[PDB]
Point group: C3
Chain length 164, copies 3
């Protein structure tokens, strides 16, 4: 069986699409429109549940476009084989909370938002829109063997940057 089961949990959810043929990642879409303040942590719900087969792991990881342009930090999620729950994106707006305020919100391309209705926001605040690609899923085979205590092993020695 060379197929992965994908289950949508709501109308807000969307089917993950792969960009190119040789590409590794499945672009994951957001199911909600959230505003993240500086240093604010949240879990972005995808409303998408997947089933990874045994002997594999899913890497719900950051997209290189958004992560290099914005202060949005995604902690790569290790989706266990047999985890049939809602995939949540572990996000953090790492932008400095320098107490300053602006009238412009920022999107996932670090662009000033063009709101007709004026509001005051914290400097370095971002907005994730619904149906917006913020993360991607990369499935990679694992290796989980048995483990036993040993006094010594069956070499690089015992070396955190031994060289420079």
């Amino acid at each position: 069986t060379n197929t992965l089961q994908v289950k949508l949990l709501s109308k807000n959810a969307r089917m993950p699409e792969r960009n190119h043929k040789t590409d590794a990642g499945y672009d994951i879409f957001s199911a909600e429109t959230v505003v993240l303040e500086p240093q604010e942590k949240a879990v972005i719900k995808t409303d998408v549940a997947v089933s990874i087969p045994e002997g594999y792991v899913g890497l719900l990881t950051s997209r290189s476009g958004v992560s290099s342009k914005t202060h949005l930090v995604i902690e790569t999620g290790k989706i266990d084989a047999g985890a049939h729950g809602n995939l949540g994106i572990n996000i953090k707006n790492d932008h400095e909370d320098d107490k300053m305020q602006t009238i412009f919100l920022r999107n996932i391309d670090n662009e000033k938002i063009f709101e007709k209705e004026r509001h005051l926001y914290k400097l370095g605040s971002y907005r994730i829109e619904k149906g917006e690609r913020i993360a991607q899923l990369v499935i990679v085979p694992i290796w989980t063997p048995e483990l036993k205590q040993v006094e010594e092993f069956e070499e690089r020695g015992e070396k955190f940057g031994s060289s420079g």
Copy 2:
């Protein structure tokens, strides 16, 4: 040989346990009780040394429970095949150092500590306890071939978020 050798280096160390059958990660325990101040970086010693076989890599990576609840940031460690040293967890308390102080320390579940003896700590300080699961190990097969200079290759072009 479908077995991985695990060597404890002290009484403070503990054997890494896998949660479920289909799960990818081996939950790694802390061997020391450390207090991390805001923006303080440290290497948490596990007192556990493992031997990954050639053609594989170990990912000493963050647990999704602690990383989403707390400001504790673990930089995923790429444990080389044949590295028989003490596994160290590359940690950083990324919480804002806003100079404020509180009498409550925080644990790996972001809960106020109930200390009977009163002390003053920096706001957003965390404590890792001994024998506490803060990180996990995921072994994944690699691929290391020979490499040669080429003027041109044998396509996605030369594209950092070409789409959005």
Copy 3:
């Protein structure tokens, strides 16, 4: 074919060297000398273009020596199979911007720079030198199947730190 094609784009580029025989990563060299201010984000150009074969992914990831010693944060890059562009290192100097200033710049080993010509820099500023190993490349096989909507699946339930 058990070979990976590596293409240098300039004289500033260098051939990635693997440290040991059992090691997973290819140490990636910098092609430019950049100074990163506190909280400053940049893309460090390697001037190196590689071609990963289909069914694999490249992990342009942080070196454990530099990442544990310095506030330099590298967001692991997922180099798609068939991406023949310049490998860019997604970097962020995560050091606090506490407005303080010093006369000493810091290198990738967190050491005070010994400049004969005196200058004023921001506290916690780092310098990447040309031909300096700041990141590494780890190639790991992937698994990309077809995907179809399912009402229910063919278990760990729907569980973000169910245990602690």
